Amino acid sequence: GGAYIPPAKLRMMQEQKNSLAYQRMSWEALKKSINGLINKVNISNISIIIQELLQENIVRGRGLLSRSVLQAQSASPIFTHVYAALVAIINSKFPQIGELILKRLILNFRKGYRRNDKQLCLTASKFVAHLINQNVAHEVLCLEMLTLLLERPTDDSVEVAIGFLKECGLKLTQVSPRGINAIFERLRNILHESEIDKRVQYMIEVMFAVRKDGFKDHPIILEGLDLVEEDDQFTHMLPLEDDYNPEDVLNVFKMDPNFMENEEKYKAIKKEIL
């Protein structure tokens, strides 16, 4: 508890010659800056947001950036795609952040699936789909998720699976046609040989209609976000079933004795990353 005070009224109180207290201040400042930038990101400003994010030591704060991106995507799924694009850029320069984001996203999806958390399933699945579209994650992840949802299908499972396929179906078709054809064959078999509600059969029908339309309402990446060339991207292969450590300890501040030295090292790398 306690009343919030504006930061201006805080700068008049104390001032800091740098090491321990500086590290704590800079850690909190980095967290605030990353959170603000993730709140600012959109398609029209993706480039400037990328360069301003790269000006920050995002490898030291890779857990902070991961947590902020996941929170933003979970709370604002309308922008999943651009978030993915953002990742797709940073992952092209610092793959460890992409791997970290991907692993905690997979654990989030699995937790939601186990916990019967609808909205979290939808958000995590959409994020996985658009990270697949940006070549950040290997397409295997999609196919295993769809097989999981359709092995013993329920109404809700078919709904979440069909919503997931809507987003990544074009990429799956270009990359793995036989897998998506198997998915559609299973969809037809469930549409016919199963007792089901009219709504879910209608959803299967609209999925077949969108495939017949060629996913014209669900492109891979919208114009303005294809910013990493296939040959320059680093596509992580993380299966769904593997046991992962989200490394939550990376979100908590710890003092490093060579702090200023590694900070200068990151500044030297930043004067290289353009």
Binding site: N116, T147, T154, L240
Partner: protein, 49 residues
Amino acid sequence: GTSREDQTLALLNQFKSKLTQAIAETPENDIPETEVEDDEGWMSHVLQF
């Protein structure tokens, strides 16, 4: 091209093997009554919102 597709389908088949075998060891997927855990029991679980 087709090599990537063979490899992805191989990984998918390994997943399906580990999946269909995980529901066998689970206590009777027709009538299981478990706890509401916080981590995961996911591979056997089914969705009911």
